[PDB]
Amino acid sequence: KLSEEQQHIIAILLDAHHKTYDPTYADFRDFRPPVRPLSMLPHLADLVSYSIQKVIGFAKMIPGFRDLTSDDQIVLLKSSAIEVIMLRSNQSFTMDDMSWDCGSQDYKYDVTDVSKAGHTLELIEPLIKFQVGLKKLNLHEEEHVLLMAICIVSPDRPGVQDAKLVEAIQDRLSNTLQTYIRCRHPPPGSHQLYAKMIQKLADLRSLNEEHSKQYRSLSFQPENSMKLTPLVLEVFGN
């Protein structure tokens, strides 16, 4: 069953998430104002930038993450950043209208807002489909934080050095998730739940890939790169 360590792992992750995800979305007011020719870029650039900071705050609390070297921690964050932001955004996504509801109407985002950031349906369509399938899973918050932590500590991320150590940390998280599903997730919602969760990690790899492509495209234009932030440039590329 759920050993003491595993129960500890869940509590730590839950708290780490609670300390990095503000469901009141109060900070969105500090971002450059959203405008509804890439009129949403300044706003979403700031939102993404803000989100990267929050994802880092979460990662540092992942039991074992700090044991990794500086370079491996950096490699994991740069490669998973966009994936965890997509994954954590599911919390504000609504299947009512396929949009992300972050408090007010000014901070309620849809397919048009993302396109107005310079992205095409080649990314947006599968992004919504992802959000929909993840939502359909109705994960317990415990499963949600474990999935984000597992996504961050992935051994196959390019540039990783101590893959062995990275894999050990992730396996400890995986076994925690698997065991939690058996012991705390009642059927039928638990039916192949683990496998479906891992499929979403594969889905994220594909989304990451497409995002990077469109990002390289968008940021290649100095006028667009100019509207981004220093953190976004450092993490996503320059």
Partner: peptide, 10 residues
Amino acid sequence: NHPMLMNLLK
């Protein structure tokens, strides 16, 4: 180098 990421990591 990643100064900002590094700074946020420590």
